[PDB]
């Protein structure tokens, strides 16, 4: 176990990277931080931007969930076959991040009064991803190219958490639906998604989803 | 190359990539999109995520400002000397992006009532960058390593727009102050920042800054 993930006991911004590690057959150590430990102050005080996750790869300490993903994509060969693909992978990931931010604000700042709006606008937000798939070998493979990239794990998590928020939201999108099923069927990932370490963790830190 | 930048006639999310292109001796064509043109709908409907900027590098069309920056970073040698530096460059850029997002929400949604609170919390938001500089050879050169990266351009823009929003905000940060002074003095960058094509564009589209 050369990697260490320091985070709160929630899926949140660490779910995609955990899926990547699990699917890639990589070993890691989870350093769980409880709300109490956080409230004490010291740890937050040591974090670059005062937030988690924190990640250790040997002697290298990183912060920022997308920085961690790009790092693993870079060192594990999950960043496209060439520079042209690397750019498309980034483009996809940034799009995922944008929607993730909107999702986070809903959950933490206006879940009750904003849900219906969010849900009605959701299909307009998902359409771009359906488009990218239709444009890459008829959506029969990955989001970019013929190989899995760190953007697939991030997109998959986004899709999964949206199905929980708005059941059947992928029904109008044939390629996204098939994509989720296909990736979810990968043996190592399938086992992980069914394990207690994933299943018994809440999606968000406030219990809403 | 060559490159085509498609954006509204404002600095905004295109300022950093323009500074990079100018300073690194690149040439690009600016395709200005007027609000009247945007509101008509044809171009927007064509944009992957329904938003600008759009960037062309031959037949490679990209969207997402940070994707454009990383693309230029890896093709122009502005992404660190190795994998560890690349990770650090990403960490800095994601931090800049987080703060830029807060700045944009302030500008577009709560300028009048939220400015004071924002400014009061600004020192805490800038401290991590002052810290990063101190950890890199006492902050005598660049944000990461001893050669310029795309993160330097993005960070420079963030600091420039904050000095306009809150005059004197960098006075408390000696390393960040000196850093902005060094970078602004770079010949090509200096000339660009003094030119009409930069100076005569508003920072943000809604006329607030
Ligand atoms: N851009 C950062 C954001 C990290 C973040 O928002 N962390 C939250 C949890 S999702 C946190 O640490 N909150 C604790 C605090 O702000 O005190 C990333 O993507 O890693
Ligand atoms: N994550 C995108 C955000 C782009 C963005 O916010 N674009 C705005 C202008 S700054 C836009 O195109 N607004 C027009 C619209 O949404 O209709 C990026 O970083 O490029």
């Amino acid at each position: 176990p050369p990697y260490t993930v320091v985070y709160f006991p929630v899926r949140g911004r660490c779910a995609a990277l955990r899926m990547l590690l699990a699917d890639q057959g990589q070993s890691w150590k989870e350093e769980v931080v409880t709300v109490e430990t956080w409230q004490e102050g010291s740890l937050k005080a040591s974090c670059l931007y005062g937030q988690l996750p924190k990640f250790q790869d040997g002697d290298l300490t990183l912060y920022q969930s997308n920085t961690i993903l790009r790092h693993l994509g870079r060192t594990l060969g999950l960043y496209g076959k060439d520079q042209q693909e690397a750019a498309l992978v980034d483009m996809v990931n940034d799009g995922v991040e944008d929607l993730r931010c909107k999702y986070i604000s809903l959950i933490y700042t206006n879940y009750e009064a904003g849900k219906d709006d969010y849900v009605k606008a959701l299909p307009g937000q998902l359409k771009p991803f359906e488009t990218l798939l239709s444009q890459n070998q008829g959506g029969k493979t990955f989001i970019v190219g013929d190989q899995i990239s760190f953007a697939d794990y991030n997109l998959l998590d986004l899709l999964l958490i949206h199905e929980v928020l708005a059941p059947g939201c992928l029904d109008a999108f044939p390629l996204l639906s098939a994509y989720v099923g296909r990736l979810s069927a990968r043996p190592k990932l399938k086992a992980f998604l069914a394990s207690p370490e994933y299943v018994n963790l809440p999606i968000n830190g406030n219990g809403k989803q």
Side-chain angles (χ1 to χ4, degrees), chain A:
Chain A
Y3 306 116
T4 304
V5 185
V6 182
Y7 194 53
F8 303 106
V10 304
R11 292 186 197 170
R13 280 182 175 282
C14 277
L17 71 102
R18 285 163 171 160
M19 294 173 85
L20 186 165
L21 291 174
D23 194 53
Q24 293 303 128
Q26 299 303 313
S27 57
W28 76 97
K29 172 73 173 73
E30 294 272 358
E31 220 85 274
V32 175
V33 180
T34 45
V35 184
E36 309 168 291
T37 308
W38 194 237
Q39 276 182 109
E40 181 270 325
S42 307
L43 184 56
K44 184 174 187 174
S46 61
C47 294
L48 185 61
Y49 305 110
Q51 295 190 305
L52 291 167
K54 172 180 173 185
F55 185 78
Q56 279 260 215
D57 181 358
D59 53 280
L60 182 61
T61 302
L62 302 176
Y63 296 93
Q64 290 293 345
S65 63
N66 294 114
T67 288
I68 295 153
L69 285 171
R70 292 192 158 89
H71 175 54
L72 296 169
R74 206 174 282 117
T75 60
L76 303 193
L78 304 175
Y79 221 135
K81 72 178 180 185
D82 52 42
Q83 295 184 348
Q84 193 259 9
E85 288 197 348
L88 302 175
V89 170
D90 283 334
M91 187 169 74
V92 175
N93 200 255
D94 286 354
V96 175
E97 175 60 26
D98 275 351
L99 186 46
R100 190 175 293 280
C101 282
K102 292 180 177 66
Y103 172 85
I104 296 179
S105 288
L106 168 71
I107 292 299
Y108 295 95
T109 73
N110 188 14
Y111 185 82
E112 286 70 40
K115 183 154 69 68
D116 296 319
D117 250 279
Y118 188 91
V119 175
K120 70 165 305 300
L122 189 52
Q125 301 299 321
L126 301 179
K127 201 178 266 194
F129 300 113
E130 177 82 0
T131 299
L132 289 166
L133 282 174
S134 62
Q135 297 174 159
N136 178 32
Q137 301 176 90
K140 295 302 176 293
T141 44
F142 300 96
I143 198 61
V144 173
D146 324 298
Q147 326 114 294
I148 194 164
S149 68
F150 69 85
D152 286 289
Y153 298 102
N154 200 196
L155 178 56
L156 182 54
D157 180 58
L158 184 71
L159 296 177
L160 293 174
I161 71 184
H162 275 85
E163 266 304 277
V164 173
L165 169 76
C169 67
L170 296 189
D171 287 0
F173 302 102
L175 302 190
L176 283 179
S177 294
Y179 170 83
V180 161
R182 189 188 315 129
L183 266 59
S184 281
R186 297 170 66 87
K188 306 205 64 152
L189 189 51
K190 182 173 48 199
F192 182 78
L193 293 176
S195 71
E197 76 187 88
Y198 176 83
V199 177
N200 293 334
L201 276 191
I203 295 180
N204 307 119
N206 65 349
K208 300 177 181 187
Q209 52 171 230

